[PDB]
Design a protein around this ligand. Structure first.
Ligand SMILES: C[C@@H](O)[C@H](NC(=O)c1ccc(C#Cc2ccc(CN3CCOCC3)cc2)cc1)C(=O)NO
Ligand SMILES: [Zn+2]
Length: 268
C-alpha cells in the first residue's frame, strides 16, 4: 500500500453531537511520511493514542490544552480510505457529527484521493492479545487483512446482535449512524453530552420501538456503528491496522486500552 493523501484541500462543517455547537473543518494535503494529524489553535495534534485525553461516549484527543472530541469518525473514514498523510484543521471543540454517519466524509475524501510514492507502515498484529472489563471483551489476532467484528447484548428488542466487517465492506458500515437508547439520553444530557443529538443525526431507540421514523437502514446498524467507531479508535495506533479483531460489548474505553496494549507489546 502506498501512502495516500488528498489531491486538493477539502472542507467539512456541521454541529457536534455532544457540543451541539457549530464547528468547521479544513483538510489540507501533507508531504509523504507526514502522518495523520489535526491542526487547532496553531497546535498540531497527531492522531495517536498518547494524545487521547477523554474516552467516553466518544474518543477525544487533546494536547497543550487544545481538545478535539469525537475523532473516531473522521479517523475511521481515513482507516477505510487508507489515508496516511493529511492535516485536519479543526474549528471548534468537537468534530461535526454531520448526519450521525461517515458517508459524507467517505464520499468527499474518496472523490479526492491521491496516491503517493512510499509504502505505508501498516500496524500488523504479530501476536494474539485480549482485554476485558466488566463483561466487555476484545480479542485481537493476526489476519492476512483487516477484519473487525462486533457483538453486543442490548436491553431492548435488539437483544444480542453481531456483524463482521472485512476489508472492502466499508460501504456497509460507513452508512451506520450513531445510536443511543431513550433511557441513555437522560444520562448523555445530565452529563452535559449529546447536546447536538437529534433524530436527524442520531438513532434513538426504546425498549421496543425506534424513535427515528426512518427506521434502521440495516438489521444491525447499532453493532455496525460500533465496528465503525472501533475502526476509528483502532487508527490511534499511528498507522493503518492489519489483522482480525472481535469485540464483545466493547466501548471507546476498551478500544483505547486495547490499542495501548497493542502498541505497548508491539513497540517498534
Ligand atoms: C455509538 C457510541 O459509541 C457513540 N455514540 C454516542 O456516544 C452517542 C449516540 C447518540 C447520542 C444522542 C442523542 C440524542 C438524540 C435525540 C435527542 C432528542 N430527543 C431527546 C429525548 O427524546 C428523544 C430524542 C437527544 C439526544 C449521543 C451520543 C459513537 O457513535 N461514537 O462514535
Ligand atoms: Zn460513532
Amino acid at each position: 500500500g502506498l501512502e495516500k493523501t488528498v489531491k486538493e484541500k477539502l472542507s467539512f462543517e456541521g454541529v457536534g453531537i455532544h457540543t451541539g455547537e457549530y464547528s468547521k473543518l479544513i483538510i489540507h494535503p501533507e508531504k509523504e511520511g507526514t502522518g495523520i494529524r489535526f491542526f487547532k489553535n496553531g497546535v498540531y495534534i497527531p492522531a495517536r493514542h498518547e494524545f487521547v485525553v477523554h474516552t467516553n461516549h466518544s474518543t477525544d484527543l487533546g494536547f497543550k490544552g487544545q481538545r478535539i472530541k469525537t475523532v473516531e469518525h473522521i479517523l475511521s473514514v481515513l482507516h477505510l480510505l487508507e489515508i496516511t498523510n493529511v492535516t485536519i484543521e479543526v474549528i471548534g471543540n468537537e468534530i461535526p457529527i454531520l448526519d450521525g454517519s461517515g458517508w459524507e466524509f467517505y464520499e468527499a475524501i474518496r472523490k479526492n484521493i491521491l496516491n503517493q510514492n512510499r509504502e505505508i507502515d501498516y500496524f500488523v498484529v504479530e501476536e494474539p492479545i485480549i482485554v476485558e472489563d466488566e463483561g466487555r471483551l476484545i480479542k485481537a489476532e493476526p489476519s492476512d487483512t483487516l477484519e473487525v467484528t462486533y457483538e453486543g447484548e442490548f436491553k431492548n428488542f435488539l437483544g444480542r446482535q453481531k456483524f463482521t466487517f472485512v476489508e472492502g465492506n466499508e460501504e456497509e458500515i460507513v452508512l451506520a449512524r450513531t445510536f443511543a437508547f431513550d433511557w441513555e439520553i437522560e444520562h448523555i444530557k445530565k452529563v452535559g453530552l449529546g447536546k447536538g443529538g437529534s433524530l436527524k443525526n442520531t438513532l434513538v431507540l426504546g425498549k421496543d420501538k425506534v424513535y427515528n421514523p426512518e427506521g434502521l437502514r440495516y438489521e444491525n446498524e447499532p453493532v455496525r456503528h460500533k465496528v465503525f467507531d472501533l475502526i476509528g479508535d483502532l487508527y490511534l495506533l499511528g498507522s493503518p491496522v492489519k489483522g482480525k479483531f472481535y469485540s464483545f460489548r466493547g466501548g471507546h474505553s476498551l478500544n483505547v486500552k486495547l490499542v495501548k496494549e497493542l502498541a505497548k507489546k508491539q513497540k517498534l
